[PDB]
Design an enzyme around this catalytic site. Structure first.
Site, PDB file in Angstrom:
ATOM      1  N   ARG A   1     -22.817  -8.125  13.958  1.00  0.00           N
ATOM      2  CA  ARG A   1     -22.472  -9.518  14.073  1.00  0.00           C
ATOM      3  C   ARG A   1     -21.742 -10.026  12.843  1.00  0.00           C
ATOM      4  NH1 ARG A   1     -23.919 -13.735  16.908  1.00  0.00           N
ATOM      5  NH2 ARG A   1     -24.048 -15.816  15.863  1.00  0.00           N
TER       6      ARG A   1
ATOM      7  N   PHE B   1     -18.143 -17.272   7.557  1.00  0.00           N
ATOM      8  CA  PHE B   1     -19.589 -17.494   7.521  1.00  0.00           C
ATOM      9  C   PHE B   1     -20.350 -16.321   6.878  1.00  0.00           C
ATOM     10  CE2 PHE B   1     -23.600 -18.331  10.316  1.00  0.00           C
ATOM     11  CZ  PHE B   1     -24.369 -18.540   9.186  1.00  0.00           C
TER      12      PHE B   1
ATOM     13  N   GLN C   1     -23.648  -9.743   9.301  1.00  0.00           N
ATOM     14  CA  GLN C   1     -25.080  -9.463   9.527  1.00  0.00           C
ATOM     15  C   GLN C   1     -25.298  -7.995   9.892  1.00  0.00           C
ATOM     16  OE1 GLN C   1     -26.784 -12.164  12.464  1.00  0.00           O
ATOM     17  NE2 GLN C   1     -28.781 -11.173  12.549  1.00  0.00           N
TER      18      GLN C   1
ATOM     19  N   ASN D   1     -34.052 -14.186   9.955  1.00  0.00           N
ATOM     20  CA  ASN D   1     -35.382 -14.346  10.544  1.00  0.00           C
ATOM     21  C   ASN D   1     -35.293 -15.061  11.877  1.00  0.00           C
ATOM     22  OD1 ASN D   1     -35.616 -17.341  10.149  1.00  0.00           O
ATOM     23  ND2 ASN D   1     -35.603 -16.780   7.933  1.00  0.00           N
TER      24      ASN D   1
ATOM     25  N   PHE E   1     -28.128 -11.260   5.967  1.00  0.00           N
ATOM     26  CA  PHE E   1     -26.763 -11.730   5.938  1.00  0.00           C
ATOM     27  C   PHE E   1     -26.203 -11.480   4.573  1.00  0.00           C
ATOM     28  CE2 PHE E   1     -28.589 -15.561   8.384  1.00  0.00           C
ATOM     29  CZ  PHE E   1     -28.807 -14.763   9.511  1.00  0.00           C
TER      30      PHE E   1
ATOM     31  N   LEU F   1     -29.031 -23.097   4.854  1.00  0.00           N
ATOM     32  CA  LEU F   1     -30.078 -22.113   5.053  1.00  0.00           C
ATOM     33  C   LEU F   1     -31.128 -22.262   3.989  1.00  0.00           C
ATOM     34  CD1 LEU F   1     -27.876 -19.005   5.982  1.00  0.00           C
ATOM     35  CD2 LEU F   1     -28.965 -20.641   7.518  1.00  0.00           C
TER      36      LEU F   1
ATOM     37  N   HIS G   1     -34.205 -19.463   4.669  1.00  0.00           N
ATOM     38  CA  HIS G   1     -34.060 -18.029   4.507  1.00  0.00           C
ATOM     39  C   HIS G   1     -34.237 -17.637   3.046  1.00  0.00           C
ATOM     40  CE1 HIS G   1     -32.156 -17.456   8.570  1.00  0.00           C
ATOM     41  NE2 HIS G   1     -32.035 -18.761   8.407  1.00  0.00           N
TER      42      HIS G   1
END
EC number: 5.2.1.8
Length: 164
Positions: A54, A59, A62, A101, A112, A121, A125
């Site tokens: 991903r 951004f 992942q 998560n 990430f 975040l 996170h």
């Protein structure tokens, strides 16, 4: 002091380059150690061979799902999931290494690598490291991503381990 681990990345099986990371054991020991162990494979399972399933340009990238390769899997060296160690560190920009998560206290193995500031975040996170070298390799990976996250080529961790 703080560990360094690396990933050598491949695109459709073709070497791209190496990314290396500082893991902030000085502030997130438990979360750092998990990533370190997964990277060296010393527990009998880990990142090596897994893919980045991903990627969303602007951004983050992942990866970490080394059991189902698609976001639905992965596990920590402690059990299926471990607690959020703390939120001392804030997603301040590109380069930041933070845990994926699915709610409070559900850290497994996914993470990430941010390619932008993602302050939303913060406190959600656990930031636990940052890119040390090869940010450019991460920027090259990033180009094979897409708005909905699907990769147009296959991005993989052909090897990984501890540099020291």
């Amino acid at each position: 002091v703080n560990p360094t681990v690396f990933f050598d990345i491949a695109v459709d099986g073709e070497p791209l380059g190496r990314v290396s990371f500082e893991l902030f054991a000085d502030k997130v020991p438990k979360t750092a150690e998990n990533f370190r162990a997964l990277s060296t494979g010393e527990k009998g399972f880990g990142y090596k061979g897994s893919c980045f399933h991903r990627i969303i340009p602007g951004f983050m990238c992942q990866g970490g799902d080394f059991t189902r390769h698609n976001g639905t899997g992965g596990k920590s060296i402690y059990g299926e999931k471990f607690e959020d160690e703390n939120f001392i560190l804030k997603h301040t920009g590109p380069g930041i290494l933070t845990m994926a998560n699915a709610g409070p206290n559900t850290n497994g193995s996914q993470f990430f690598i941010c390619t932008a500031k993602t302050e939303w975040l913060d406190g959600k996170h656990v930031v636990f490291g940052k890119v040390k070298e090869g940010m450019n390799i991460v920027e090259a990976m990033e180009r094979f991503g897409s708005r909905n996250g699907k990769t147009s080529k296959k991005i993989t961790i052909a090897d990984c381990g501890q540099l020291e």
